[PDB]
C-alpha cells in the first residue's frame, strides 16, 4: 500500500517518532544521547532512527518553535533525501556567545536552570540535551524533480531580475 | 469553496498579508509592534494576525532575502500547523556580536542609520523593527502525513547510509 | 512539454546544476567566485545561474549538511519565486566568533586547513569558498497560493492558540 512510512530503530536508545495532534504537520524526533553543548559548540546529535522516504518527497528535519525561541540552540534544517536509510542526525549549534564567564548551572532545552547536588563549573550559556527529549521534528513535503534544459533566454519575460528587497 | 485562506486580525495594530506579485510564492507579514533588538537579543515579534491553514498543508513563516542579507536579524522558520489559530509570532534573534562598543545610531531593517533629533546611546549593532514594516513572509506547501510502520529492514536497498558530505 | 526547468548560465564562471543521485531531492549549486569570509562577515555569493521556476512552485536555495555541519558557514534559505529570472545569490554568513586571534591557515568548506607556499596572516575562523565548489542545493516544492478572506472567527474550533512548546 501507499500512505505508510518505514522507520527503523537502530538501538535501544532510539524512540519512535510521534505526531502531537491529528492536525499537526510533522513527527517529533527524540535525542538518543545526552549531550552538553558549550557556547559556539557544534554537533550532530544522533537519533538512532532511520527512515525510507519514498521518491517524489523530501523530509525537512527541522527545529521546534519552543526550543528555538527559548534557547540559543539553532538547528540547521536537514533535507532528508528519498533514499537516505542512515541514522538521522540533528545538525545543531549553541549560538550563545562565549563571553568567558562561568556558572554552576547548565540550562535545559526550556532554558530552565538544572539543579544538581554535586557542584560543577560550566561555561555560561551551556546547554544539556538529555536522552529522550524532543528536540526536532520531521515534516515531509512533495518535490518537483524535472530534467534541466540550458537556454540563452527564457520562454517568457514582470519580476525579472528584481530581488533582495526590491520592493 | 476551496482555494481560500481564513485570516483574523487580532488588533488595530495588525495588517492583512499581501502577495507582492501574482508570480510570487508567499504573503508578506507585517510587524504589529515597534521593537529594539540589541546584539544577541531574542524575541517573538507579534503580528496580531491569526490564520487557519487547512489539513494536508503547513505554513512556512520565513525570512525575506532583503532583511536577512542586509542585517544580522535571523528569523528561524516557523512551521505553522494546520490547526494553530493563535497569534503568529516571528521567532527572531539579532545575531550581531556584542563587542561592548556604543553608538548614537540604531539601524533599520535595510541596515540604514536612523537619524533622530534627541540623542541616545545604543549598543553597536542594535536594530529597530518599526510597527508596520515587512519583516517576514508566509509560504504554504502541501505535506505528506502517513502512518508509521516500524521495521527491522527496509523494502529495498544506492544511497544507503551515505550522507553529511559523502560526495 | 512539462517536467522541464529552464536554466541560463550568465557567464563562463557558471556551472550547470546537477542531481547527485536519481533518488536525491535537489540540484547542487556551484559558486561562480572565489571568496574569503572573515568571522561575522556576510555576503551574497553569486552563482551566475538563473532559472525560471514555473507558477505553483517555489525553489528552496538551501544549505548542504556537509558544509553546515563541518563549518560555521550558515546559509539562510532563499525562497526563489516562480518568476525571478535573475542571478541566484547564496545568502551566507561566517558565524564563527571574532575572538581577535590570528593564524596563517584559512579553512576550506570541509573545515580542512589550506596549505599555501606564500605565508599570509588571517583572522582565526576565516573561510575560503573557491570558484566551482558545491556550497548549496536547490529543492523545488509545490505551493498553495489561495486568496485571503478576512474573518472575525474561524470556520471550526483542538490545537487553537496553543504553541511555542505547549506540550
Ligand atoms: O540534518 C541532517 C541533514 C542531512 N542528513 C542526511 C540526509 C541526506 O540524505 C544526507 C545528505 O544531505 P545533503 O545532500 O543536504 N548534504 P551533502 O550534499 O553535503 O552530502 P551528500 O554529498 O551525501 O549529498 O544527509 C541528516 O541525517 N541530517
Ligand atoms: O515562528 C513560529 C513558529 C511556530 N509558531 C506556532 C505555529 C505552530 O502550530 C506552533 C507549534 O510549532 P512547533 O510544533 O514547531 N513548536 P513546539 O513542537 O515546540 O510546540 P508544540 O508543543 O505546541 O507543538 O507554534 C508560530 O506562531 N511562529
Ligand atoms: O538567497 C536568495 C534569496 C532570494 N533570492 C531572490 C529570489 C526571490 O525571487 C527574490 C526575492 O525573495 P524574497 O521575497 O524572499 N526577498 P524580499 O521580499 O525582501 O525582496 P522583494 O521585495 O523583491 O520580494 O530574491 C535569491 O536569489 N537568493
Ligand atoms: Mg510539535
Ligand atoms: Mg517578497
Ligand atoms: Mg552568533
Ligand atoms: Mg547533495
Author numbering:
A (entry chain A), B (entry chain A), C (entry chain A): 1 to 157, 159 to 168
What does the paper say about this structure?
Asp95 is responsible for chelating a divalent ion in the Dut threefold central channel, thus we produced this protein using two alternative protocols: the first of which included MgCl2 in the purification buffer, while the second did not, allowing us to evaluate the structural impact of this ion. We obtained crystals in the presence of a non-hydrolyzable dUTP analogue (dUPNPP) for both proteins, which present identical space group and cell dimensions to the previously reported crystals from wt Dut80α protein. However, the models built from the data obtained with the crystals produced with protein purified in the absence (Type I) or presence (Type II) of Mg ion showed small structural differences but with relevant mechanistic implications. In Dut80α D95E type I crystals where the Mg ion is absent, the conserved motif V that covers the active site was totally disordered, even though it was occupied by the nucleotide. In contrast, in Type II crystals, which retain the Mg ion, the motif V was visible over the active center with identical conformation to that observed in wild-type protein, but the density of the map was lower or even absent for some residues (Ser158, Gly164, Gly169 and Val170), supporting a weaker stabilization of this loop. Furthermore, Dut80α D95E Type I and II structures confirm the proposed allosteric effect between the threefold central channel and the active center, showing the fine correlation between Mg ion binding and motif V organization.
In this conformation motifs IV and VI provide the recognition and binding site for the Stl repressor, meanwhile the highly flexible motif V stabilizes the Stl-Dut complex once the repressor binds to the Dut.
